[PDB]
Point group: D2
Chain length 727, copies 4
């Protein structure tokens, strides 16, 4: 045949295009000129296709790939069909075990560069010079669900970064909240068992809203801090581009003089912090369970590269015990009001992978993979993680040679006396496979530690204690950080936390677990406890009403850096606006709308009651991106309704529903000319309302008003009004 069309419409343009303009494709075909040392080094295993003959894996050309070999055209298939058997066998063996946690994830390639040399505090080569660029590979993920679960669940998110440094791979394997649920790695199977689907029936997926999770939390108050972050809007990010990242544990930075400095790692999203609202997130898991995966991929194809600032909280070794919390306790955060985040460098994700399985699914990150200039601490959760990644990757990725899988390979040299193992790629020519050896003059050889290019030596921390299985008494405080978090949130963020706990505990079948969680909230803050209790039909006791609130954290009664929205940081580039078309669109409005959006890097999606095209007043042919039902308001940041023949869409139920949903979800809406007739559906004032942009036409200040609302993300003042709308 064949039938790719004559117009060449099958193939997407190899240039940045806005979401939905062209079919997506493998990164190296979408952006062939985007390169980095790692992307180039993968060239040996990239496999093309065009102009090549179809063959078996042994290189034999196939003549007929449509039929098995049989004795007669209606006869039995013959065992000698080696073509069919290789093809079916490889298909039969396609799947590998998904990760134990973080199985649902989306990744991209990029690069990192420090703003200045950090040689006074660390000898890490990748932070030693502002013009030294280090390729990275980043994988973002949910945490509980399987690899086929949905993106916009309520859950913690993983944020893992593989740095291909000149002195080794450093993996920074963090999450989107600055603490973890538990204190010691020994409890990790217990916690993860409690949050994952229950064992009898394997329900629920991607949800902590079930009895065993809340049983565990209620019995293990150390979890309450991260639970508070998960119940807030932090648990439902708008995009991986708009959430923070944290390494959680205190690590060490080691300089050339041997000085150790404690450090906690942060990633700041340069697109700003932004989250969905629960009803929107939950409905989006049904409308588009691949929303975050798609959003990341389309941002990079559009040139809206995710950018993050690496930042360090630095504490001198002499200040280890100066806080009212233990620095080694992963359930405690270090307030930025106490220890500021120093900016360190920028990370840009600018290329999607070519093959998700080969590059994303087989990537292996490990917090153990550190480099000279970095070291660990005794945090008891970090200590046990050091054992687990290595162990799980051998079974997940089939053997001990997972570092030879292309995405995992260092770009710098690697030489040692390790040999064999399943799927061994490297063919070693060294005469010796042991050291010391004389037969190869002891090569490859050990290298002493030094200021640069030196071997790894651990910091010589003094260890003094008996061999004990004991929690440090300093870790036995569970309510002051949850309280600090609570008081740092805005009133509307506090309401959403309450709503999250209420919704989750309403799904817990055993009422006494609900009551025990409420009792724990009474140890954090009474207003919080009472608001959740009222939603659960629970009444606090007199004793509960008199629980003394936990102490402030080093005199802090709040830290605004813990809130998503108290300090504006809203950027609109990369956001999307739905434009609800009609069959006689006033092109003056459309011109003005698209020009204003284009100027700020905001994308548009043209919607209608059907697919195809509609023609504007002026004759302009407009292509329809999707239908009102086909691409609901859940997927956009704002909605504009231009003037024209509004009767065409005024009696359309889907069109009205579109605005009711967007209104409920606090998204800015802009109506021009006769589009103002839609105000009745969303029942608000004859004279108007903050959050609803309206004018006779879409001109000068109309688009400016709409853009200012989008920079603020959502219209929080509309909260009290949304409860009367049936949406």
């Amino acid at each position: 045949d064949s039938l790719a069309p004559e117009d060449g419409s099958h193939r997407p343009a190899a240039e940045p295009t806005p979401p939905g303009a062209q079919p997506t494709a493998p990164g190296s075909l979408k952006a062939p000129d985007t390169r980095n040392e790692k992307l180039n080094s993968l060239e040996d295993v990239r496999k093309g296709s065009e102009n090549y003959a179809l063959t078996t894996n042994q290189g034999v050309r196939i003549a007929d790939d449509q039929n098995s070999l049989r004795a007669g055209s209606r006869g039995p298939t013959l065992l000698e069909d080696f073509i069919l058997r290789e093809k079916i066998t490889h298909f039969d063996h396609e799947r590998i075990p998904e990760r134990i946690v973080h199985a649902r994830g989306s990744a991209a390639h990029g690069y990192f560069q420090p703003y200045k040399s950090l040689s006074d505090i660390t000898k890490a080569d990748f932070l030693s010079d502002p013009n030294k660029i280090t390729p990275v590979f980043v994988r973002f993920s949910t945490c509980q669900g399987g690899a086929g679960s949905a993106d916009t669940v309520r859950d913690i998110r993983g944020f893992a970064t593989k740095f291909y440094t000149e002195e080794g791979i450093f993996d920074l394997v963090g999450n989107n909240t600055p603490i973890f649920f538990i204190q010691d790695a020994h409890k990790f199977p217990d916690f993860v068992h409690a949050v994952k689907p229950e064992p009898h029936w394997a329900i629920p997926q991607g949800q902590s809203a079930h009895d065993t999770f809340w049983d565990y939390v209620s019995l293990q108050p150390e979890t309450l801090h991260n639970v508070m972050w998960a119940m807030s809007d932090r648990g439902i990010p708008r995009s991986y581009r708009t959430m923070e990242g944290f390494g959680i544990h205190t690590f060490r930075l080691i300089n050339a003089e041997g000085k150790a400095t404690f450090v906690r790692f942060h990633w700041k999203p340069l697109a700003g912090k932004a989250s969905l609202v629960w009803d929107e997130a939950q409905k989006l898991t049904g409308r588009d369970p691949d929303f975050h995966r798609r959003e990341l991929w389309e941002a990079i194809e559009a040139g809206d590269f995710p950018e993050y600032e690496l930042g360090f909280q630095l504490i001198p070794e002499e200040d280890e015990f100066k806080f009212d919390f233990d620095l080694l306790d992963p359930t405690k955060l270090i307030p930025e009001e106490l220890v500021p985040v120093q900016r360190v460098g920028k990370m840009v994700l600018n290329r999607n992978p070519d093959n998700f399985f080969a590059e994303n699914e087989q990537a292996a990150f490990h917090p153990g993979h550190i480099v000279p200039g970095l070291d660990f601490t005794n945090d008891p959760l970090l200590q046990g993680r050091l054992f687990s990644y290595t162990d799980t990757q051998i079974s997940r990725l089939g053997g001990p040679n997972f570092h030879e899988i292309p995405i995992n390979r260092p770009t710098c040299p690697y030489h040692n006396f390790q040999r064999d193992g399943m799927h061994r790629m490297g063919i070693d020519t060294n005469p010796a496979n042991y050291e010391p050896n004389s037969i190869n003059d002891n090569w490859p050889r050990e290298t002493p530690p030094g200021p640069k290019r030196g071997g790894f030596e651990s910091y010589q921390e003094r260890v003094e204690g008996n061999k004990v299985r004991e929690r440090s008494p300093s870790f036995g405080e569970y309510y002051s950080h949850p309280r600090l978090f609570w008081l740092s949130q805005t009133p509307f963020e506090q309401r959403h936390i309450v709503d999250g706990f209420s919704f989750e505990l309403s799904k817990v079948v055993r009422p006494y677990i609900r009551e025990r969680v409420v009792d724990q909230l009474a140890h954090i803050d009474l207003t919080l406890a009472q608001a959740v209790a009222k939603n659960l039909g629970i009444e606090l006791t007199d004793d509960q009403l008199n629980i003394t609130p936990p102490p402030d954290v080093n005199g802090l009664k709040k830290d605004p850096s813990l809130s998503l929205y108290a300090i504006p940081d809203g950027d609109v580039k990369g956001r999307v606006v739905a434009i609800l078309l009609n069959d006689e669109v006033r092109s003056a409005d459309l011109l003005a709308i698209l020009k204003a959006l284009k100027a700020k890097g905001v994308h548009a999606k043209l919607l209608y009651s059907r697919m195809g095209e509609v023609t504007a007043d002026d004759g302009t042919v407009l292509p329809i991106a999707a239908t009102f039902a086909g691409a609901p308001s859940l997927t956009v940041d704002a909605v504009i309704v231009p003037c024209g023949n509004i009767a065409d869409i005024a009696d359309n139920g889907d069109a009205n529903y579109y605005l009711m949903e967007a209104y409920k979800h606090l998204k800015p809406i802009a109506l021009a000319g006769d589009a103002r007739k839609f105000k009745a559906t969303i029942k608000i004032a004859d004279q108007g309302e903050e959050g609803i942009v309206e004018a006779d036409s879409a001109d000068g200040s109309f688009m400016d008003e709409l853009l200012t609302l989008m920079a603020a993300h959502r219209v929080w003042s509309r909260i009290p009004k949304i409860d009367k709308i049936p949406a």
Copy 2:
């Protein structure tokens, strides 16, 4: 200790109860008196819990299952903590590869019995006497999505039955529509690749609504029949109890005299045929991605046993 409440409300009643009345539980605890030969034969590997000491896998009692062994209560974790290492090791290796297709599925135990002896057309032992009961294990599934994807997607459903007969295991591995998309098994990897998530970005999950599926369909008209069924409300069943089942292929029955009879296998839902509507099914993928799994489980806990002829 003593974390359970003194009114015993942690434990669900061991008697049929309506959906939502009691917490769900393992079948043998919820219905200890429901038995069959296969269920009885699994007793040798069933492991209890109550009143036993917590141990390693080698039988060593654990004293402190809350902490790793370290040098000092704020010190480094020690390599000799064999208890931590067994526990983390087993956790680290919990997962196995999901099924290539039909990775999302929900299953139950039951039994079969023929209405009358079918010896005139087949010598299969399990079809030879109305009083002969055959334990079964049935797994229903979606077809495209992974094991963690949602139940009420638009897709073909699998309906697989393992009959534990006295002359061997017979597995009847069918779907909820009477035909399949393709004609020759050589094309199965092509079709499946086309319907599954696209390879550059692995989207979309649980959906045939993407370009590669329709490209393949457009190029292979043999697919149109099953496509018609999938696009109908057949592709969004109300429950596994309310859909039909088919073996699809023509098989043979062979009687004692050696006569072969062509046969196609069917399962009729005794609860009747019933499907959702698209907007409902898609929204239900978001509000309860485990809706069919939950519905199956709770119907059985309530005594509303799924029955098929």
Copy 3:
């Protein structure tokens, strides 16, 4: 540091050197200028060592590769030691499952070239042009034992050849005998279980001399033909360089016009056929269980490259039923007297691998791997093999991407829609992973069958019959081929067959199995059966004595091509002679001996009672290779004793034993001057005897005589005399 010596004696010369002259080494270091297309394409995975730092697999330099990280120098090891954990983990996972059969094997690289274009009979591209060179990788093996078992056991040998052709990989997976034990693949697990170590105790290794094997054989007379070959000296080859190879099955050759020709594949050893004798092979299993592996590696390092001529027996389609046996029956051979072997091309093995595990142990051959121009037949052993190799290789090599392990990769192009699988190396950029597709204009595309570069199409053989599990009546004849083999053997080869059966059946514990085997031998030949029975204390019945011998094969009462030795083909290049020195060797004799050996490509190993050196009469310092006991006569082809101070070695028990062993095992012996005193230890007459070269000095005709004996391999006329020697 500095472990290597200053004289550079740790490093072997990168030039051809005789066995034992230099330490052996990886092939690319030993022979860097030897190349072929496959060796060159492996360069991307070869890893060096000299002048590089020692690192983890992630690229981090190691400073101390001698110690674990601990709390205090006498303290507990710390979980955070990621360097120790990676190194120990990779060691812990070094082994993979051995092959189910042919686990013990030795391999080398080389090349093949046809003598002329065979386009008239086959369109296979690698046989299309005399100038077309095809790289090969060949693995020879025993069949029963584990990878750690001994080389010189009595067993069939595997001979597998991977051809890296321009139109795909062609694997020719043969054995050193022209038939197999069984007729249908369904019984392979039964046969292999019977031959392998018994299941209760896992004894015996590398031996078919145990009850279950002979039980099976006695019950399944189809096995008798191959058992005859295995009991002959064919089951104990001198080296892989001196055995034959066969494809066994009838396959097909397909030309451009579509004509099918039946073909059986053969390999002829250009060094000639040669085998050990049983006592020598058994003792060598103890002294040097790696004898064949060492002999192959050392021959290539010396430039004595193994050479084999590929040959075809061709039968026209219309002659399928012209013989007394079925061409599809793999327990039947095609006598060369009926169908000559046509010479096709030459194969030369000229480079050893770099890493045994990576290249040899992970190599995967499959008889299924054919190319356009070749096809299968209905042989029911071959048919079942087509299924098995695919299946076993996935578990053995870890997944469905074993074709990406370097040694298995094709050198020609390979492109298809297969994806994923554990350890996926290739990163596919095709936008499509299915066909037919329009999104990549249907590439990679199928190719029609044609005269060259065409897609594979099976020959359209007519199939007619019911679906049955039934053996063809034509295969139900079991004794005529065993009888033809027996009658084709020399008298001393016949005696060795008798002795094989007798030794093996003496180790069968259940006497009735021995008796049943003797009864089977009575159906093949009465002389054979009575000679085995007399060694077992079994007396044939009158009925056994009157069993009619089976018919001749197509009129043939013998075929000399079935004998190892009936038609001389002895070459001496590559063979070794032990020279037994004394403390005052006569230099004149040594000069002449070495020069004559050197001129024919025969190696020498200078032996003495101790290591070090000895000084010859004229001051020549003579380096000692090994001692009389450290390098027994088992390892050499002949023994020369030069003149000098014979008293120094005449009272040496080890020296005398050296000659008694060599004598017993039929090796040529040459004694010069006072060395003739050793004649009494081997009880040879005063006058002399054929096979013992003697003179006053070692020159003119003495070396010619010895080399003439070496060309005839062993001294068969001395068999009657070796019985009286206590050795």
Copy 4:
């Protein structure tokens, strides 16, 4: 785990303890034991925290390491006493 195929090698007959073994570990390739415990974690109230930890004691007690005193720096160094 790689030699014997997964983390349930303790269920291979020759390796099995003859004494009781109960805990919250689940799944893994070739899982033989079918756990009926409502809970797969601890602490839990839904099975009244069983199976439960046991204090160390004279007999039938839980395992507790001997409280050896550790005092030193983190070092990759051979004791001089071993030289």
